From a paper:
Endothelin receptors belong to the class A GPCRs, and are activated by endothelins, which are 21-amino acid peptide agonists. Three kinds of endothelins (ET-1, ET-2, and ET-3) activate the endothelin receptors (ETRs) with sub-nanomolar affinities. The stimulation of the ETA receptor by ET-1 leads to potent and long-lasting vasoconstriction, whereas that of the ETB receptor induces nitric oxide-mediated vasorelaxation. In this study, we report the crystal structures of the ETB receptor in complex with two ETB-selective ET variant agonists, ET-3 and IRL1620.
The EC50 and Emax values of ET-3 for the ETB receptor were similar to those of ET-1 in both assays, while the EC50 value for ETA was about 5-fold lower. These data indicate that ET-3 functions as a full agonist for the endothelin receptors, with moderate ETB-selectivity. Similar to ET-1, ET-3 adopts a bicyclic architecture comprising the N-terminal region (residues 1–7), the α-helical region (residues 8–17), and the C-terminal region (residues 18–21), and the N-terminal region is attached to the central α-helical region by the intrachain disulfide bond pairs (C1–C15 and C3–C11). Despite these sequence differences, the N-terminal regions are similarly accommodated in the orthosteric pocket in both structures, because these bulky residues are exposed to the solvent and interact poorly with the receptor. As in the ET-1-bound structure, the N-terminal tail is anchored to TM7 via a disulfide bond between C90 and C358 in the ET-3-bound structure, constituting a lid that prevents agonist dissociation. The high-resolution ET-3-bound structure allowed more accurate tracing of the elongated N-terminal residues, as compared with the ET-1-bound structure, and revealed more extensive interactions with the agonist peptide. P88, I94, Y247ECL2, and K248ECL2 form a lid over ET-3, which is stabilized by a water-mediated hydrogen bonding network among the carbonyl oxygen of P93, the side chains of Y247ECL2 and K248ECL2, and D8 of ET-3. In particular, the water-mediated hydrogen bonds involving D1472.50, W3366.48, and N3787.45 in the inactive conformation collapse upon ET-3 binding, by the inward motions of TMs 2, 6, and 7. The W3366.48 side chain moves downward by about 2.5 Å, resulting in the disruption of the water-mediated hydrogen bond with D1472.50, and consequently, the D1472.50 side chain moves downward by about 3 Å and forms hydrogen bonds with the N3827.49 and N1191.50 side chains. The N3787.45 side chain also moves downward by about 1.5 Å and forms a hydrogen bond with the nitrogen atom of the W3366.48 side chain. The downward movements of the W3366.48 and N3787.45 side chains consequently induce the outward repositioning of the F3326.44 side chain and the middle part of TM6, by about 1 Å.
Numbering used by the authors:
A (entry chain B): 1 to 21
B (entry chain A): 86 to 303, 1000 to 1159, 311 to 403
The structure:
């Protein structure tokens, strides 16, 4: 799971809930 | 800087229940099936050949994938946490992609091996495991491992404060350290879609198509061998003319030496009237091409031949071999019935002919082929084997495509639909979480499904699973 920027905390939280892939 | 969302990111408990039941079933069934498959292949010296060792590599990849992908993702779904530290953060996705590589490259290798088994005439038939297959599998595993290295470099634990609460997150972190790893972070999911889905689908579909095209030619050979015999020595046909192979007329001259000189010309060596089966098969394939060219130059036969499927085309070529282009054209009403696809009507009409009266055994088999569009009237061991090989490759490839598509679509949808500036974007993120966990379960269902497909498609495996499990 990845995100464009660390400052997108919603995307990072999603990766925290997301599958490992 | 992207705004916070107006809505939550969450996974509903009802989905967690359903997804975890599926995960446990795929896990238990996949470990039993792939372990039993491996034990079948190791225990039976009769099961240790080229393709089954490739299947063993696939089964090991299945087990690796199931063990690395399901337990950790069940844990993430239920615990919503990462307790295992950075080393496991890197190792788990590394091993996961290695096992996917082994799976797709083993599938690719099997489709090529099955094609070679049909197409090669010099391949020695027997129980051996070729020297090259051993190095073939080592290379599959080394390549799969090397291609997964970016996962071990790119994943790491980061920390953030998220609306008050401190989180430790294992992910492919934004801001990679080198230019290559930055590019990997942005392209990874197109890379996985291309190299681990589209490319093996294209490769196996290509070799499957080459293989089934070749099997069609083998079937026509076996059909005419049954009906006209394979004669490796010059003989005289029913009209007294020197002939060889599968009804290949050499000359109408009464001189055996004249027939021998024609034969030597067509083979390119001094045969003294005796050829090999490989030589007869090449001769036969040219005779089929010539019969087809003649059929297409015949205004009465061409419309019929065009409209027929490949099997029924072979029955028409069969009749042309037996009675020539002009004789076959004489079946005016029967050819019309075939062109209109009135199979049962054409079959009853063809049985009223002088052709059926003179050679009823052969005509019955050709008529069955016209009636059914199958090779059933020519069923022998080679045909049963070819049907099973075809179904095995088709089924393995189809289940791969269906099982892995959802996870790739999930990652592609995020790439194409996610707008980090949208304050409502967490509804999409919550939906993507569901697709992602479904996608993991479907991908692992592939690993679980491969032993089941072999059980249903292969009589040899079906019985092997019976001995190992029902006793
Ligand atoms: C990371 C930098 C590059 C280093 C990368 C190399 C090191 C890791 C590779 C290991 C695979 C080695 C080959 C292992 C082959 C196992 C094949 C196998 O298990 O196949 C089962 C079959 O029954 C067989 O007969
Ligand atoms: C997202 C998609 C979900 C579903 C995706 C499928 C994965 C689960 C299926 C396992 C069985 C697969 C093997 C089924 C084989 C059919 C039986 C068969 O091939 O029989 C051949 C026989 O010799 C003449 O028909
Ligand atoms: C026994 C081997 C031969 C038979 C082969 C079939 C075996 C089926 C057994 C287990 C799969 C189903 C187990 C179900 C476990 C459910 C746990 C669960 O659902 O809890 C998650 C919950 O949502 C948390 O919030
Ligand atoms: C290198 C090889 C790695 C091999 C694989 C290592 C990872 C296995 C870890 C966990 C599996 C756990 C299976 C399911 C356990 C669920 C426990 C749980 O979810 O906790 C409940 C939570 O606290 C409710 O609030
Ligand atoms: C997206 C397209 C690239 C994807 C896979 C290439 C696989 C390359 C496997 C070899 C490893 C490359 C590597 O390790 O480079 C990292 C660099 O050293 C920084 O630390
Ligand atoms: C598929 C079954 C077999 C799987 C196992 C095969 C043997 C492992 C061999 C090579 C792996 C090499 C690991 C790559 C080196 C780690 C890179 C790394 O950790 O980078 C961190 C980065 O520098 C920030 O500190
Ligand atoms: C062997 C061929 C396999 C993969 C080659 C293709 C690798 C995929 C390259 C994708 C490059 C790319 O387009 O990444 C940027 C993307 O547009 C951002 O959303
Ligand atoms: C019958 C098999 C023929 C041989 C196989 C050929 C290669 C396989 C390539 C694609 C298959 C899956 C395609 C459908 C999957 C979705 C593609 C997609 O969503 O991409 C759209 C666009 O690129 C914005 O993302
Ligand atoms: C062998 C099959 C390889 C590729 C065919 C499928 C094409 C996959 C190409 C991936 C790169 C790509 O699609 O670029 C993304 C772009 O930004 C928007 O689609
Ligand atoms: C058996 C194999 C085939 C199964 C394949 C299953 C693939 C995923 C299913 C549905 C996704 C459909 C797309 C849903 C798009 C939702 C759009 C949305 O929620 O928001 C859009 C966003 O706001 C704009 O920026
Ligand atoms: C009492 C237990 C439930 C009753 C028995 C049910 C049987 C389940 C079988 C098929 C359902 C299909 C599952 C399809 C998964 C879609 C999940 C989903 O989309 O929910 C996301 C939601 O929007 C988050 O915000
Ligand atoms: C062998 C075959 C196995 C078959 C096994 C059963 C397959 C059921 C799968 C999907 C049905 C799901 C239907 C559509 C679910 C998504 C609809 C949707 O968009 O959800 C709204 C979203 O959650 C708003 O927040």
């Amino acid at each position: 799971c990845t995100c464009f920027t660390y400052k997108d905390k919603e995307c990072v939280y999603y990766c925290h809930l997301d599958i490992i892939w | 800087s992207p705004p916070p969302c107006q809505g939550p990111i969450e996974i509903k408990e009802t989905f967690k229940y359903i997804n975890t039941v599926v995960s446990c079933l795929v896990f238990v069934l996949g470990i039993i099936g792939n372990s039993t498959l491996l034990y079948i292949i190791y225990k039976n010296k009769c099961m240790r050949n080229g393709p089954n060792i490739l299947i063993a590599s696939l089964a090991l990849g299945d087990l690796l994938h199931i063990v690395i992908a399901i337990p950790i993702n069940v844990y993430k779904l239920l615990a919503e946490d990462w307790p295992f530290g950075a080393e496991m953060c890197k190792l788990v996705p590394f091993i996961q992609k290695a096992s996917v590589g082994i799976t797709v490259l083993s599938l690719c290798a099997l489709s090529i091996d099955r094609y070679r088994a049909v197409a090669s005439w010099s391949r020695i038939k027997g129980i051996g495991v070729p020297k090259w297959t051993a190095v073939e599998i080592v290379l599959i595993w080394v390549v799969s491992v090397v291609l997964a290295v970016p996962e071990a470099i790119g994943f790491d634990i980061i920390t953030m404060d998220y609306k008050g609460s401190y989180l430790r997150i294992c992910l492919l972190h934004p801001v990679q350290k080198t230019a290559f790893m930055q590019f990997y972070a942005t392209a990874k999911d197109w890379w996985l879609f291309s190299f681990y889905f589209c490319l093996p689908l294209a490769i196996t579909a290509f070799f499957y198509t080459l293989m089934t095209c070749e099997m069609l030619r083998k079937n026509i050979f076996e059909m005419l061998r049954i009906d006209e015999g394979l004669r490796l020595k010059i003989y005289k046909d029913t009209e007294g003319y020197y002939t060889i192979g599968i009804g290949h007329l050499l000359t109408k001259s009464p001189s055996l030496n004249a027939a021998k000189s024609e034969l030597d010309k067509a083979i390119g060596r001094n045969t003294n009237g005796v050829i090999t089966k490989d030589e007869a098969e090449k001769l036969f394939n040219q005779d089929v091409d010539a019969a087809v060219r003649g059929i297409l130059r015949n205004a009465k036969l061409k419309p019929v031949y065009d409209s027929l499927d490949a099997v029924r085309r072979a029955a028409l070529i069969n009749m042309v071999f037996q009675m020539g282009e002009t004789g076959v054209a004489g079946f005016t009403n029967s050819l019309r019935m075939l062109q209109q696809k009135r199979w049962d009507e054409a079959a009853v009409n063809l049985a009223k002919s002088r052709w059926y009266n003179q050679t009823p055994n052969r005509a019955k088999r050709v008529i069955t082929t016209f009636r059914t569009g199958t090779w059933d009237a020519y069923l022998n061991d080679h045909l049963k084997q070819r049907r099973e090989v075809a179904k095995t490759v088709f089924c393995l490839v189809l289940v791969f495509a269906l099982c892995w598509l959802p996870l790739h679509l999930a990652r592609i949808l995020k790439l194409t639909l996610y707008n980090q500036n949208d304050p409502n974007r967490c509804e999409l993120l919550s939906f993507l979480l569901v697709l992602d966990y479904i996608g993991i379960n479907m991908a692992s269902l592939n690993s679980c499904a491969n032993p089941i497909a072999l059980y249903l498609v292969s009589k040899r495996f079906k019985n092997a699973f019976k001995s190992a499990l029902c006793c």
